[PDB]
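Q: what does this look like with CN3 bound?
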Amino acid sequence: AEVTQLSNGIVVATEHNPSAHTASVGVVFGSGAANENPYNNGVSNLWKNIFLSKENSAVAAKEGLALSSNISRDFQSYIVSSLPGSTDKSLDFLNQSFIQQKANLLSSSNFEATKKSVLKQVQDFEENDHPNRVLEHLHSTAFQNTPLSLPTRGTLESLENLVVADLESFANNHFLNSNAVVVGTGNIKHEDLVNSIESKNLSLQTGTKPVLKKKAAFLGSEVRLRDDTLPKAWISLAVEGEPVNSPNYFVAKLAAQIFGSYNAFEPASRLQGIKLLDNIQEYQLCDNFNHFSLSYKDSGLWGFSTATRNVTMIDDLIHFTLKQWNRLTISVTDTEVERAKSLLKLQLGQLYESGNPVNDANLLGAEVLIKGSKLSLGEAFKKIDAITVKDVKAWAGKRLWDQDIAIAGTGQIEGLLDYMRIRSDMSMMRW
Amino acid sequence: MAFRKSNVYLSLVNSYIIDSPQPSSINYWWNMGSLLGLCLVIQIVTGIFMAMHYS
Amino acid sequence: MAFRKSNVYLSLVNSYIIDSPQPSSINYWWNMGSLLGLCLVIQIVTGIFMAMHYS
Amino acid sequence: PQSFTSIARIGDYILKSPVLSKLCVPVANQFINLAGYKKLGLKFDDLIAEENPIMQTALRRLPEDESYARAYRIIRAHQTELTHHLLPRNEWIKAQEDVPYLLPYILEAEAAAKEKDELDNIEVSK
Amino acid sequence: PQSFTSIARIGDYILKSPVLSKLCVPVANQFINLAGYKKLGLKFDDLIAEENPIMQTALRRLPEDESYARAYRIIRAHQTELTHHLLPRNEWIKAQEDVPYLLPYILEAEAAAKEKDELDNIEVSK
Amino acid sequence: LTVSARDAPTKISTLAVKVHGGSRYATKDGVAHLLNRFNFQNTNTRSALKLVRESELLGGTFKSTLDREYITLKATFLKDDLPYYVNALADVLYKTAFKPHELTESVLPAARYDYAVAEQCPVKSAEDQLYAITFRKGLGNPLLYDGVERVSLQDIKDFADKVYTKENLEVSGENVVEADLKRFVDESLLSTLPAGKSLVSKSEPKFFLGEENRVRFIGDSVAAIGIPVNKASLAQYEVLANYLTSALSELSGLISSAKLDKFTDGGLFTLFVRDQDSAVVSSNIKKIVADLKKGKDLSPAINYTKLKNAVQNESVSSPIELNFDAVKDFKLGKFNYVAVGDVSNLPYLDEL
Amino acid sequence: LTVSARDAPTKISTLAVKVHGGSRYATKDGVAHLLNRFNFQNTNTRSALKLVRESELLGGTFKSTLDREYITLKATFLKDDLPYYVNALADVLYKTAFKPHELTESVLPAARYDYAVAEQCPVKSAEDQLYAITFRKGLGNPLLYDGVERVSLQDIKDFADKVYTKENLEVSGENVVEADLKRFVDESLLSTLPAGKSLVSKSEPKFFLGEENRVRFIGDSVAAIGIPVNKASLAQYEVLANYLTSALSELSGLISSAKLDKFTDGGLFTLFVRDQDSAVVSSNIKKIVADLKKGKDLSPAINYTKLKNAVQNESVSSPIELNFDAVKDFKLGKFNYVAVGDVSNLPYLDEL
Ligand SMILES: CCCCCCCCCCC(=O)OC[C@H](COP(=O)(O)OC[C@H](O)COP(=O)(O)OC[C@@H](COC(=O)CC)OC(=O)CCC)OC(=O)CCCCCCCC
Ligand code: HEM
Ligand code: HEM
Ligand SMILES: COc1c(O)c(C)c(C/C=C(/C)CC/C=C(\C)CC/C=C(/C)CC/C=C(/C)CC/C=C(\C)CCC=C(C)C)c(O)c1OC
Ligand SMILES: COc1c(O)c(C)c(C/C=C(\C)CC/C=C(\C)CC/C=C(/C)CC/C=C(/C)CC/C=C(\C)CCC=C(C)C)c(O)c1OC
Ligand SMILES: CCCCCCCCCCCCCCCCCC(=O)O[C@H](COC(=O)CCCCCC)COP(=O)(O)OCCN
Ligand SMILES: CCCCCCCCCCCCCCCCCC(=O)O[C@H](COC(=O)CCCCCC)COP(=O)(O)OCCN
């Protein structure tokens, strides 16, 4: 259980697992939706779908190869999967169809067919997926006029004016050897992957990606998208949090785990050791909530999201939740900290030790692109067990107590009160 | 729910003073009713302290 | 509905005096609170008519 | 008020002891006959005050057939009292019928509230 | 208040008459421009008071698309007035857009209330 | 009592108890769904609240699942705390309390929620119907409780005594020392369970061909077909399922779903066509059946199927269907059919 | 335009207009049910309120009914006031207003009530199913509107123009001077309607045999069978229906209902078995079919059928089935079957 990195001008990372039955090989780039502008937003989402189109997936299926891809704000992925004794064929396909030749993929017929499907994907998302479009709107009001505001799928208006030239320009600027990591997970040995690469030569482009003029900045604000015909209210609320490669990275994750997640219709979720639940269940002000701590290269967010059918008691839900947050500065106990320690270990122990090599490749490539190295799971546990009550109170006194907030909501949100009555609940007065 | 909404006596204060919905566009001509309530308190208090010395 | 239930002021009289649900078994000891209310009216009225002649 | 867990702890100690039971039980029987709630057609568990959450819980868990009879005994007693009469002596509750039909539902709800409440204020070791 | 049936009866008489229309219409146009409700982005039927049953009926019968736009014009005007500004001159309601979009729904609800009321107080022959 | 485990150098362990107590063994409609919601309630020795609080401080969670053949009780935890979770699952199978107020307050409102969620999906409705007309009273029994047949507390308590028997169990561990799991299991209370018998039949099931059912429904329209499959023809239909969804096929854009459900005594192939316009659903399903009746060669999809099969068989004991070598050719014979939605505008069986 | 009437010395008269506009001619599912609820709403010349108030002072009422072949508009009144009600029914067929707020406020909430009442009856559910599997798109169309197919106001307005045509009508009067009815009708507005065509087909309908359907339902259980009948075999099945419910039969206590529905191009015989225990329903229906397959003599029920037929044909134009003389013998051939309720415990078709 250890990763091995080498460099030849090309970075090559690998987590070998001898007891698996598959192998994944791919390339991860260090540019995401936070590396484009409002005019070409969605060009990366359209690159993913050109990779996964028919005539490229057909050519892989005849050889016994499956394909995958993912767009995020800091990185992109293009992965190939196979049986363990078929990994050299995986690398060849990744060489031919992607890095060297792509005139086959950017044809006039394949481009229009791909654009039609992607527009239908995005239009469907904006009309039916309410919890996820409110979290995207939160990012856009918190980081307005800054690169961390742009949605990852793109916007239906900017996505309509794209041509092949926009794709080719974006490729020449960001798909570069200086901005790339080659990964390998599952039943694959490091030496074999290194040997297969030097037998070929395998370089995409040289480097010099553009530098981004503006840095990300948090701004307290709100955006309300009112729709009285929907049957619920969906709300998300956050403060500024921690970026990746921060000293307070695990302390913010432990603090989110203290308040946790809830489903009203599951019996065992009603019995969790969370003091907020003693307040909501007597009048049943929500159906579910979840606390998050999101982290990027430049900034982060810390907060919660909720959905509810009780549209006359929204003000009681927001009030009781924000008063529990205040206790992290004043009166958090030792039992609440020892519970969140061991449940945080179970959480990220399941994220980093699933059975899917595709998830391993995305995690590994994103971490090595920032830190140059991966922190093992035995090391992360020791940092978590060394946190005390004093560290939590010091973090909360700086990040939560009387600080500005960002809010987004949709649906039946008449009962959501104004900004300054919610902002005033971030301090107590009775300390 | 909050104590200010559950108590018999504070529920009336909350519904009249704290959470009462008001139109967003009312101007300073809507502030005279508040003043007439302070006026009545001034007169009743000043008058009771004089009645202690009046014949 | 009936006017005694719809009017702002008579609705309070109806809910306290007319339609108020009472237990079937309360005895005459539960009648003292009514008398204390007539007592306070007797004293306030008789006192104001004497204050017209007092020094 | 006093808990039924504490009432049962003291009572069981008195009852298991031979000397105390021979000395305190006859006093308790004639305290029951002088009270006079059977003469209105009530069992003792009808008299327990019900405006508290442990007692509201016990009444939901009660079977339907025992719950319909309780409502009738309570209505019959209110009507007997506004007329200032007693019931016929052939309608009085007998001793063998004055059973604690609701006590097990109360002791179960009390034991769960104590377990929950200890768990919310625990001192953890390291 | 005065009925829209009576308002329309007087108005139509003035308008069908040539001499009266040449004498009373220019006064009415400049009464509209001096009022200044277009400068806040409102049509006249937005101003009619709605706390009465004939007017509550007319607003239910209104189509959904015309009803969503009415709500936005009213919110925009409240916000314009608490800032003590006017809207940009390219957002003012023009004359050709200031149409009576709600009048037919009002006259239909009024005519039905009069027919129902006459029928409840009829004098019958024999 | 059969035990098995595989070790690893990881941090997280997983433990599972599998019981042949699914819907196909149910005495009444929905008694296995309700029993699924009783476990991890109060035990004779500890409450459901204390279990949640104790395991949270140790770093672990619990879960129970139902399917047509299995009820599975699962725990996920940190590696060192093995003997705690062995004893916890044993007491669930041994001495669950089964109190009446738990049925009224917790179990029935949860089963009501599961049903109400599922009956808003037309694809899941079409799937139960194909199981009901193809098989009748085994595999075709209903999955969830809806209340058309009254299930009492003694019915649930009698079902638990039927299926929680030592010869009907499988214990399995991922990242667990097998020599230590065997030691903890023999000293636990699930070694004291009554020895009954296994309920698996080594007969094949009886099936029916040429059936039809229609259902009216507000929403999206569905058209689905189903074919029963015996054990010898099983590798052939697996290749067909993955072929029809891959990019090797011309009609993979007209299909919404296709799969093969595998049991130890056969399987059922299913195919689904979903859309909102009902003329689209009719035009597509008629093209699917006309083309499949003429013939397809499946040899191009042998290696693509080997990949997918290895992927989905990752954490599983794997009914070994390692015979994709001899698969070439498929021609559609006889099948069953169901329609859901605007059935006045969807095709009938004998015009396909 | 066909007119007919019979006089009497009575006090009360009755007038009816019959239109071939029932469910079997419906363009979309439920457009004839909605049109049925639009008539006697506001007219271009008078309101629905004034019609109720004016006719009350004259002593009369109005009513409209729907079945699978007919929409019937009926008036009942005191004898002397004939020309008022002739002109009222004519304006309903000519110049109904069809305003959108009437659909929203009056018509749709009433159709919602009709449907919700009917779907609580399992015998009526079994009857629609037998009509749906025996016939498919004519006689088998749905009767009531349920919303699975969206019906707009222009759809209703286009259906009315289709069926309210002078060659699709029948005017009939009870206790009315026929010479005066003809005079008032020719001077009314229904003499100005557009001359279209009649919609009756003189083809026979296409039917299907050997079908089946099962529906889950909370409540009572039902088992029903259905047989199509052509015009020549019609008197035979009428005798069978009245025989099986009379006291001449040994199994008349096991049956809940039996009847024959008559059209001008055939009929449908129906039989029903209803009970709360589902074992009773299964034991009975198996005895009914085993005994009917062996044979029954029907000659003892010829004169009892003549009585009943004359009773139910009292106020009716009477498709004359005056051929009970030649009826003796019936043996059950092939049929259709439906089950409603606890279908896990009700029989299947091929075990009857
Ligand atoms: C200062 C003046 C204030 C004016 C009013 C004061 C009244 C206070 C008296 C205390 C009280 O309210 O309770 C009285 C209580 C009986 O109440 P209960 O409901 O149980 O019995 C209803 C009755 O059977 C039916 O009485 P019924 O309604 O049938 O007839 C009415 C009765 C009038 O009685 C009264 O006014 C009651 C005050 O008619 C007659 O008496 C006919 C003779 C002319 O009797 C007792 O339990 C014990 C009474 C002795 C102790 C009194 C000492 C107080 C210092
Ligand atoms: C609405 C409330 C009241 C109003 C508008 C009012 C008005 C007045 C006015 C106009 C005067 C004559 C002022 C002058 O000296 O030129 C006066 C005098 C007086 N008032 Fe009041 N009054 C009010 C309440 C009271 C009350 C409640 C009391 C007693 C408790 C009181 C006690 C007196 C006394 C003792 C004087 C004597 C003259 C003086 O001290 O100026 N007033 N009041
Ligand atoms: C709860 C209401 C009241 C109570 C219990 C009360 C009590 C008393 C008592 C015990 C006395 C002495 C009686 C005696 O002469 O032996 C008294 C005197 C007096 N009270 Fe009141 N009082 C009340 C209300 C009022 C009010 C509101 C006023 C004025 C408006 C008033 C005006 C007077 C006056 C002028 C006297 C002078 C002595 C007399 O006339 O007897 N009282 N009061
Ligand atoms: C639009 O909505 C509004 C709103 O805008 C406002 C402003 C208010 C607040 C405005 C008000 C006018 C309410 C205020 C109440 C009053 C004016 C009534 C006052 C009544 C009294 C009885 C006053 C008497 C005061 C005393 C202090 C009497 C006691 C005397 C003493 C202590 C002095 C003598 C003592 C000694 C020891 C010598 C609303 O309530 C409200 O409703 C929702
Ligand atoms: C259980 O149900 C009950 C209930 O049983 C009862 C009995 C009551 C009845 C009432 C009470 C218990 C008490 C309430 C009483 C008050 C608040 C008393 C107010 C007292 C006054 C004396 C007000 C007086 C005002 C005046 C203006 C009169 C004074 C002077 C005058 C007229 C002289 C001036 C005249 C001239 C000509 C210049 C309930 O309200 C009630 O509902 C809950
Ligand atoms: C319109 C005229 C008359 C009506 C006046 C209404 C407006 C008056 C404002 C009153 C100010 C607030 C008074 C105290 C609020 C707290 C009460 C309380 O805590 O209730 C009791 C304490 O009991 C008391 O001692 C009452 C003393 C009353 C003091 C008299 C001034 C405890 O609180 P309780 O549990 O009852 O509240 C229910 C919500 N769960
Ligand atoms: C103030 C002490 C604190 C406690 C509250 C006091 C409440 C007791 C009040 C006693 C009852 C008073 C009788 C009111 C008679 C009916 C009123 C009425 O007709 O309402 C109005 C007309 O009233 C008036 O114009 C002025 C009334 C002034 C009354 C001054 C005493 C009728 O209008 P409407 O039909 O719409 O009814 C109101 C619906 N909310």
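Residues B 6-7, 9-10, 12-13 surround 9PE (ligand 6) (CB under 6 Å). Chain G is about 35% helix and 20% strand.
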